[PDB]
Amino acid sequence: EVSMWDMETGDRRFTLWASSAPPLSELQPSPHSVHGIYCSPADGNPILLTAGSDMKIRFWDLAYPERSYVVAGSTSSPSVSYYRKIIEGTEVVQEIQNESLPVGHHDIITDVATFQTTQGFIVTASRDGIVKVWK
Amino acid sequence: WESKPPPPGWRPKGLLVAHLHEHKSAVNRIRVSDEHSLFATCSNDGTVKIWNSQKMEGKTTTTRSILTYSRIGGRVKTLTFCQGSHYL
Amino acid sequence: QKLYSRAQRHQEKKEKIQRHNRKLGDLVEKKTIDLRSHYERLANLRRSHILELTSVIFPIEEVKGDTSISITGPWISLPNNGDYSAYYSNPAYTISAALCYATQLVNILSHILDVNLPKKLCNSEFCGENLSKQKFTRAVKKLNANILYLCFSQHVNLDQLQPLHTLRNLMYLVSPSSEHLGRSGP
Amino acid sequence: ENQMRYAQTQLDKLKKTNVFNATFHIWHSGQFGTINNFRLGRLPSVPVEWNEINAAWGQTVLLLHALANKMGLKFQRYRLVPYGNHSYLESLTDKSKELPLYCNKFDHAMVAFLDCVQQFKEEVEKGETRFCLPYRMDVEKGKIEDTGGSGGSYSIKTQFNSEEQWTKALKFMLTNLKWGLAWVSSQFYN
């Protein structure tokens, strides 16, 4: 879940729906989530980098989430798939999915940190001590 | 929520600098320095690994945590870089 | 009274969350035990594969870092430190064969030892090309850094292998005689 | 759970791709013979590196030496230099004139390699159910013959066989060594 809440109503009204649970599902059939979000305004909407508990290195988009590029892995997935909708006065998004050594973290990643100036690096970690310093 | 909001078109790519597994236990608290080029690493082992981007990146024998202090004890899972307070 | 009803609900929620906390703690303990078991199984498998490889392709053995180590037949034998200083251009030939096998086995261990190469393209560039020039500098630097990473993840005794003991630490860790063979992690 | 998943996935990948599997990184079919991610045999419209050819030749010398030291396969022309490019293949009984696996000495190395390959096939075929007979390799006359009935004429000569026949014979050697090392890995893993 990555939602934006109107605290006046005090509930989240924003989505990138990717879960076995239906939107605001009572049982939430999907227990997976994403955290460690980083916020900055650009490209007509907020631009965020949040740690995807699914190990999905999340460079997230709203207007064209499928169109843009993100740091996540899972190369078996075709061109990025993200749904853009407008639902009851707000634009709703549904996120849909598309030898060697596992490069991606192998623990519950939570923390992200990046620095750059026209170029730079980012820091990643997992739920056990994994350190990932992305450029 | 970032200084100097960037122009549109931000997308990620497949590059990185270094990886570490020094933290004996889970790490769930880090602090990123503002005036300098360093970030803090702490682990559920009650120990904190200090890492400097300038040093840890490479061109050096080992990219070990510069400041590793465990006198705190317990599990260190809460850290912060004080805003212009010269304290952590 | 309204606030008290809300608080009683929140307190029942707290009790349930604490029960779930205990359950999740026991489960995380079991999961960590399983992860440690998987790491130990990887250690054992890596030890077996490395012993088999050392026996078959590269019998890395000491002579009987100046002392020489023999591997891949009599045509290939080299001392512990590693003649990096002599690469500016069988000693040359044996050293080159040893270094080719070294980069290959470096990737091999990266797979088995799970030590993914920060310069993954190791075997090819390291083994063949007569890159004595600055490219040799960069390659030797990458090789030394990777060997340092290997010795650190297998830092059973840093003072024993010591710096400038390429073949020395290579045989020590790689040979099944390693004190902590198969270990991986922090 | 995720860390154990990564660890067990690496372990399972190693189990599937045996040590020899990665070391050889060889293929049985394709535009050329592939071992350790190499291309064996060029064509009038196919690019390949002859320096990579010498590298793969040294790799073949090292692999044949390891196999022979593992079990037989070292009757004659059994003294091979497992060093790589400019490799040498000589008999343990004969060392008067070196046979360089690089540059009639190169074709001589090819013929001696065919001889050692037939010796190994004898070693490989020793199983109760005969093995290494999807094709047959001839040492002296330069014949790379497939028991699968393929009509393609493959020879080991440096002339009239260097592009199509050479590519085919290199890939055939790769696949035969693939079968032999597959048996070797099946044995060794146990």
UniProtKB/Swiss-Prot annotation, chain B:
Start and end residues of the WD repeats are 22-61
User: Coiled coil located at which positions?
Assistant: none
Question: What's the family?
Answer: Belongs to the protein kinase superfamily. Ser/Thr protein kinase family.
Q: Where in the cell is it found?
A: Late endosome; Cytoplasmic vesicle, Autophagosome; Membrane
Gene symbol here is PIK3R4
Tissue specificity note? Ubiquitously expressed.
Q: Which domain of life is it from?
A: Eukaryota
Name by which UniProt lists this protein: Phosphoinositide 3-kinase regulatory subunit 4
Q: How is it modified after translation?
A: Myristoylated.
Of the intact sequence, the residues represented are 970 to 1057 of 1358
Q: How does it assemble?
A: Component of the PI3K (PI3KC3/PI3K-III/class III phosphatidylinositol 3-kinase) complex the core of which is composed of the catalytic subunit PIK3C3, the regulatory subunit PIK3R4 and BECN1 associating with additional regulatory/auxiliary subunits to form alternative complex forms. Alternative complex forms containing a fourth regulatory subunit in a mutually exclusive manner are PI3K complex I (PI3KC3-C1) containing ATG14, and PI3K complex II (PI3KC3-C2) containing UVRAG.
Function, please? Regulatory subunit of the PI3K complex that mediates formation of phosphatidylinositol 3-phosphate; different complex forms are believed to play a role in multiple membrane trafficking pathways: PI3KC3-C1 is involved in initiation of autophagosomes and PI3KC3-C2 in maturation of autophagosomes and endocytosis. Involved in regulation of degradative endocytic trafficking and cytokinesis, probably in the context of PI3KC3-C2.
Curated annotation (Swiss-Prot), chain C:
Q: How is it modified after translation?
A: Ubiquitinated via 'Lys-6', 'Lys-11' and 'Lys-63'-linked polyubiquitin chains on multiple lysines by MARCHF7, leading to ATG14 aggregation and loss of interaction with STX17.
What are the subcellular locations of this protein? Cytoplasm; Endoplasmic reticulum membrane; Preautophagosomal structure membrane; Cytoplasmic vesicle, Autophagosome membrane
Please, which domain of life does this record's source organism belong to? Eukaryota
The UniProt comment on domains reads:
The coiled-coil domain is required for BECN1- and PIK3C3-binding and for autophagy. The final 80 residues in the C-terminus define a minimum required region for autophagosome binding called BATS.
The UniProt function text for this chain reads: Required for both basal and inducible autophagy. Determines the localization of the autophagy-specific PI3-kinase complex PI3KC3-C1. Plays a role in autophagosome formation and MAP1LC3/LC3 conjugation to phosphatidylethanolamine. Promotes BECN1 translocation from the trans-Golgi network to autophagosomes. Enhances PIK3C3 activity in a BECN1-dependent manner. Essential for the autophagy-dependent phosphorylation of BECN1. Stimulates the phosphorylation of BECN1, but suppresses the phosphorylation PIK3C3 by AMPK.
Q: How does it assemble?
A: Forms homooligomers; homo-oligomerization is essential for the roles in membrane tethering and enhancement of SNARE-mediated fusion. Component of the PI3K (PI3KC3/PI3K-III/class III phosphatidylinositol 3-kinase) complex I (PI3KC3-C1) in which the core composed of the catalytic subunit PIK3C3, the regulatory subunit PIK3R4 and BECN1 is associated with ATG14. PI3KC3-C1 displays a V-shaped architecture with PIK3R4 serving as a bridge between PIK3C3 and the ATG14:BECN1 subcomplex. PI3KC3-C1 can associate with further regulatory subunits. Interacts with PIK3CB.
Q: What is this protein called?
A: Beclin 1-associated autophagy-related key regulator
Q: Which residues of the full protein are shown?
A: 149 to 394 of 492
UniProtKB/Swiss-Prot annotation, chain D:
The organism's place on the tree of life at top rank: Eukaryota
Q: Where is this cross-link: Glycyl lysine isopeptide (Lys-Gly) (interchain with G-Cter in ubiquitin)?
A: K143, K178
**Record localization:** Mitochondrion; Nucleus; Cytoplasm
Task: Specify where the region named Evolutionary conserved domain (ECD) lies, as residue ranges.
Answer: 1-190
* Region Required for membrane-association, annotated ranges: 166-190
Q: What is this protein identified as? A: Beclin-1-C 35 kDa
Q: Which organism is it from?
A: Homo sapiens
The gene name on file is BECN1
